[PDB]
Design a protein around this ligand. Structure first.
Ligand SMILES: [Cl-]
Ligand SMILES: [Cl-]
Ligand code: NA
Lengths: 76, 262, 75, 76, 73, 76
């Protein structure tokens, strides 16, 4: 299955994931594609924040869904 | 961690302007100031932004405040400005947690001149409240006088433990004036407010420990709705301020009444 | 004391509440009187959300005041 | 020791403290038993606004004496 | 006792106060001499802001201490 | 690398800093270039107040970034 992730710059990155994958593993896939560290990412869908310990199937993530990505650059 | 906000786009003055919604309690003072700037088109965001983060909101406000570049100033204005900006930034981060104001009950714009009250001067954003004492009643106006909240609240403490009968009377009267008006708005305050705010003015209104964006359309005051709960309700943009009890009328982006959703 | 809870659909709920009642209690009081689960409920007064955890006295809610209701969207 | 903290509304709080504690300590104690921010707190004994840097011994704090807690007008 | 109030320009003024005077009262004294309204004055001592409701003794304002005046248009 | 520091008076300074430099080191480099003492300095980046004990990597301050300088009275 494929899911889309939109960044603040408007670029959409597509990844290949399974519904049983946790959000931390998906953040590691974002680190492999875009090079961002998982210690600086925040994923958003349906007006809620995706916890790192929750799986994609736990958040009712469907196929061909577009999740937003926001970052923590200036810490504090 | 970080706070994220949702952008609600509305039609203000025929043009598509964005306002930033609020979820958890706290971000109110920053959201009131920036919503003033967004509606007056002084600060603007890319056209399809749906959510925005806390760092971005502070970056926008910080860049707009520090890049004003006013050169026509003397040594008095310049050095006072650099100091008024220095103390403004020591507090600027508090605009996300919660801003403290000291309120005096004699005028709709009368506040203690604190480093928090500076941000609303460096941006020329008027700041109003409505916690005014009724001048026609004498026994309260004598007990509260020209005191501020942080002064009156200390006054009733020193009055309670006095031995004079007239002093405990004034202390109890002032305490009752605070207990009866805990909503931080009085009938006389709403009357003088409507008179002082100019038509079409964009300001920030303090009330009930909240900072909300305010305007005046055809002699009537309105507060912009900032709650995320109304983010998807496109026909609630302004709430009329016409009573002290919060029985406001919800209006749309053009100040027309909203039909019930059936 | 009694307070009113207007909503977007036009309804107007009335509840006999006390200042010490927590925000989840008025939400459960709405579940009794007009049958809405506090799971999907969210209140507003003076343009500010009344958070789950505080009380009406922590928001200075006065008698015969008018609260506002909406559906809690975030899960 | 045992001291009383009295709000304007009449709400009185009990607190097990020691004259060796600082005012900043007592403000943290009230934050734990009430949720009130330590920044918003203003304690009052004998007309003085008690300063975070000093200790209760410097204010002649005695047992079952009461400290009036008052709160700054915070908008959030 | 006498304290001195120095604006950011360098002009230092002389006032006759008592340690039991509130800063709102001291502000009224500056209005008497310079004409500046109290709600347009900002009094700083050792780089820290001074609240209108407190007294000089509450801030450990000793004799011959000098305070920074900052203005507001 | 190189970062810029902009005064409210238009004058913009350039410092040769390191991404592992502490804000105290940057304030000292502003002293070595202009003479303003570090106590009279307030450093701003994107609405945040640059704190003394952190470094440029914590705030994500990269090459050709610009910080804002606000002069302050002697803070004590
Ligand atoms: Cl319009
Ligand atoms: Cl103002
Ligand atoms: Na208008």
């Amino acid at each position: 299955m494929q899911i889309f992730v939109k960044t603040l710059t408007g670029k959409t990155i597509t990844l290949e994931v399974e519904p049983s994958d946790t959000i931390e593993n998906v953040k590691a896939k974002i680190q492999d594609k875009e090079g961002i560290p998982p210690d600086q990412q925040r994923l958003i869908f349906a007006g809620k924040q995706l916890e790192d310990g929750r799986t994609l199937s736990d958040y009712n993530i469907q196929k061909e869904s577009t999740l937003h990505l926001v970052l923590r650059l200036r810490g504090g | 961690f970080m706070s994220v906000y949702h952008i609600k786009w509305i039609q203000w003055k025929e043009e598509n302007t964005p306002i930033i919604t609020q979820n958890e309690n706290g971000p109110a003072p920053l959201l009131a100031i920036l919503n003033v700037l967004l509606l007056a088109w002084k600060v603007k965001l890319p056209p399809m932004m749906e959510i925005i983060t806390a760092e971005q909101l502070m970056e926008y406000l910080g860049d707009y405040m520090l890049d004003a570049k006013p050169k026509e100033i003397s040594e008095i204005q310049r050095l006072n400005y650099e100091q008024n900006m220095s103390d403004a930034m020591a507090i600027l981060h508090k605009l996300q947690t919660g801003l403290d104001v000291n309120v005096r009950f004699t005028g709709v714009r009368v506040f203690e001149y604190t480093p928090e009250c500076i941000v609303f001067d460096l941006l020329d954003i008027p700041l109003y409240h409505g916690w005014l004492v009724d001048p026609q009643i004498d026994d309260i106006v004598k007990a509260v006088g020209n005191c501020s909240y942080n002064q009156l609240v200390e006054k009733i403490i020193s009055c309670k433990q006095s031995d004079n009968s007239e002093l405990v009377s004034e202390g109890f009267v002032a305490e009752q004036f605070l207990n009866n008006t805990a909503t931080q708005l009085t009938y006389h305050g709403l009357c003088e407010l409507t008179s002082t705010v100019q038509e079409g003015e964009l300001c920030v209104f303090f009330r009930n420990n909240h900072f909300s964006t305010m305007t005046k359309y055809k002699g009537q005051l309105y507060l912009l709705v900032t709650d995320q709960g109304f983010l998807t309700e496109e026909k609630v943009v302004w709430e009329s301020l016409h009573n002290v009890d919060g029985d406001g009328n919800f209006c749309d982006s053009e100040f027309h009444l909203r039909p019930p959703s059936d």
